[PDB]
C-alpha cells in the first residue's frame, strides 16, 4: 500500500506537501538466497497482481504509476552515511560514533550477533529504529518535523493496536522503532 502524498520514514523534506506526489518513491528490498542466476538459469520474474482499477476499492483511473524492479548489487546503506546501523548496539552506556553521522546515533562497536537481550529497559533504549533515536531526540536531526510526535516517521504500531480499516491498521506496521517489544503480551505487540 503506497501513499505518495504521505511522508516516508526518515524524510526531512521541508516542503513535502507542496511537492508533486508522483515524483516520490516507496520501495523495499530483499536479499536473495541463490545469487548465481546463470547457473540456476533464472529466466524471469513472475507475479500475479490484482488490477487496482477494477473492483470495489478501485483506485481512480488517473492514478497511474510504475513499479520498478532491481536485481543485482544494491546498496544496503538504507540511511546513507557510510555506516552500518544495528540497534542492538545502541544504548546510553554504549559507545557511539564520536561525531553524530547525519542520521542519528550509530554504535561505534563492532557488531557480533544481530540479537537483543531480553531486558525490557535495554530493549526500550535499543529498539529505536534505523536512525538510532528514541523519538525524543529525532527533532534535532529531523528539524522540519520536530513538532510532531514522531519526527522521523519510523514509529511502529501493531495492527491490532491501531484504529480504522485494514489498510489504516497496517500503515505503521513496518516502523522500525518499537517493533521489538520484549513481551508478546505488550499492547504494541512486536512483529519481530
Amino acid at each position: 500500500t503506497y501513499y505518495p502524498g504521505e511522508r516516508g520514514p526518515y524524510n526531512n523534506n521541508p516542503s513535502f506537501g507542496a511537492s508533486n506526489p508522483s515524483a516520490n518513491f516507496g520501495g523495499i528490498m530483499r536479499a536473495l538466497n541463490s545469487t548465481n542466476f546463470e547457473q540456476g538459469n533464472v529466466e524471469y520474474i513472475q507475479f500475479w497482481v490484482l488490477d487496482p482499477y477494477v473492483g470495489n476499492g478501485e483506485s481512480p483511473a488517473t492514478n497511474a504509476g510504475k513499479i520498478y524492479f532491481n536485481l543485482g548489487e544494491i546498496s544496503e546503506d538504507v540511511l546513507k552515511d557510510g555506516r552500518k546501523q544495528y540497534e542492538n548496539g545502541l544504548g546510553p552506556d554504549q559507545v557511539m560514533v564520536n561525531p553524530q553521522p547525519l542520521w542519528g546515533d550509530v554504535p561505534a562497536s563492532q557488531s557480533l550477533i544481530y540479537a537483543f537481550d531480553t531486558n525490557p529497559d535495554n530493549r526500550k533504549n535499543q529498539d529505536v529504529g534505523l536512525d538510532g533515536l528514541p523519538s525524543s531526540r529525532e527533532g534535532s536531526i529531523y528539524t522540519n518535523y520536530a513538532g510532531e510526535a514522531d519526527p522521523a516517521g519510523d514509529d511502529y504500531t501493531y495492527y491490532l493496536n491501531a484504529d480504522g480499516g485494514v489498510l489504516e491498521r497496517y500503515k505503521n506496521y513496518n516502523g522500525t522503532e518499537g517493533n521489538s517489544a520484549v513481551s508478546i503480551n505488550d499492547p504494541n505487540r512486536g512483529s519481530t
Binding site: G5, E6, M29, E76, L102, Y159, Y170, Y173
Partner: protein, 48 residues
Amino acid sequence: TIDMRSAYAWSLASTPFITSINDNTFNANSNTLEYGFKRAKLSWYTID
C-alpha cells in the same frame, strides 16, 4: 519457482537510481538528508 512474497523478508529499501548511476531522480546521489526527501510512505504486509 523461488517464492519472494514473504513480508518479513522485505525491509526498507535504499534510495534507487532510475536510469543510470549518474541519474538523480530521487536524490540517490546526494550525501545529505536530501537522499531521503523523495521517499513517500509505503507499507508492506500480509493481512493477518
